[PDB]
Each structure stands twice: as C-alpha cells, then as structure tokens.
Amino acid sequence: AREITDIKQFLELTRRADVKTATVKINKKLNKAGKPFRQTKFKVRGSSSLYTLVINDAGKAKKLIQSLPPTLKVNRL
C-alpha cells in the first residue's frame, strides 16, 4: 500500500530477507499531451507492506530488472 521513489531504498527492500516475492507490471500511458510511453511498476511484497516503485523511464526500467536479486520470485506481468 506504500509507494517508493528512492531507487536505492528499493533495491535494499528487495533484499530484505522476508521479501520472497515481487511482481513487475507494465502500462501504456500517454506522455504529457501527445504520444505514448511504457510505464513500469516494481512491486516488492513485504510481510506487512506492499511497496511499488514506478520507473516512468523505459531505460531505468530494463537496467533495474537485471539488478533484481536472482533469488527473488519475480512474477513478470
């Protein structure tokens, strides 16, 4: 139910030992007024809180997904 924005604090979260599962979501939404763009939402699930980090930037998106700990059960989409 929480929202995160510090990309660091996010990664730390993803390695928080009680965090067994995440889930990436992708959304087509428009940019400013005109064309579209791909939004992505990173959702780490904690014992109590479900944190979700929105990378509006398709690039920081891709490079973030490799940073995801190999032992985290990502559900893609």
| Residues contributing to the site for RNA (CB under 7 A) | 1-3, 16, 18, 23, 25, 27, 41, 43, 46-50, 52, 54, 75
Q: How far is the CB of 16 from RNA (least distance, A)?
A: 6
Type and span of the H or E element at 15: none
Closer residue to RNA, CB minimum distance, 1 or 70? 1
Closest distance to RNA from the beta carbon of 59 (Å): 19
- Which residue lies nearer to RNA by CB, 2 or 73? 2
Which lies closer to RNA via its Cβ, residue 28 or residue 71? 28
Instruction: Give the long-range contacts of residues 49-52, CB within 8 A, separation 24 or more.
Output: 49/1, 49/2, 50/1, 50/2, 51/2, 51/3, 51/4, 51/10, 51/13, 52/2, 52/3, 52/4
